[PDB]
Amino acid sequence: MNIFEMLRIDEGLRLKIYKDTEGYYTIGIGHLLTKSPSLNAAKSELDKAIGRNTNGVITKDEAEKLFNQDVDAAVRGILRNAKLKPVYDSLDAVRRAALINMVFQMGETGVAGFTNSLRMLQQKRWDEAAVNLAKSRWYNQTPNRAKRVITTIRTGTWDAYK
Ligand SMILES: [Cl-]
Ligand SMILES: [Cl-]
């Protein structure tokens, strides 16, 4: 198990524009296209992202290309972030995957915001951090995915995904 396979399980793969849980236009592996209510604004963005006139549909390769870009941007965002970097440095490899997952889903700014949990993560107070992370909209909105991430964080194993 690795971060790619972990995210692919969590986000799925869709070759046609779709709406996410929040209602936003998305494509491939959890790639947010736009927060705009317009399918046309989403088709525009998608065409810009792919470099071709897609008509709202892409290939698996295209989707994988986007995914590769997003994991990288996720990683670089963490390392560039003053609040995130130190948490990530302090973690083992499994737990790092978990933070990358959060970041990929909710943005760097989003995660950087979880001040109290970041502090518990750094002090390696696993159980407590798990309890605090569940007290969020994230968990309430996408509970099954959130539980998997929180379990990876608490345990440091890949059980939840096995
Ligand atoms: Cl892009
Ligand atoms: Cl869910």
Q: What are the two backbone dihedrals, phi and then psi, of residue 124, each rounded to the nearest 5 degrees? A: 50, 35
Resolution of the experimental structure, in angstroms: 1.8
* Residue 35 C-beta-side C-alpha neighbours within 13 Å: 1
Instruction: Give residue for tokens 């107070």.
Output: 125
Task: Specify the DSSP element, H or E, that contains 11.
Answer: helix 3-11
Tell me how far the alpha carbon of residue 12 lies from the centroid of ligand 2, in angstroms: 12
Instruction: Give residue for tokens 């929180």.
Output: 150
Instruction: Report the sign of the C-alpha dihedral through residues 54, 59, 64, 67, in that order.
Output: positive
The verdict on whether 92 is a catalytic residue reads no
Domains delineated in the chain: 1-162 (1.10.530.40)
Technique used to solve these coordinates? X-ray
The verdict on whether 10 is a catalytic residue reads no
Tell me how far the alpha carbon of residue 143 lies from the centroid of ligand 2, in angstroms: 5
Phi-psi category of residue 130: left, alpha or beta, with phi > 0 → left and psi -120 to 50 → alpha? alpha
Token pair recorded at residue 120: 């518990």
**Contacts for 133 with CB less than 8 Å, ≥ 6 apart:** 114, 117, 139, 146, 150, 153
Residues with CB under 5 A from ligand 1 (ion): 49
Provide the annotated binding site: 32, 104, 117, 132
- Sheet order of strands, 25-28 included: 14-19, 25-28, 31-34
> Which stretches does DSSP call E strand in the chain?
14-19, 25-28, 31-34
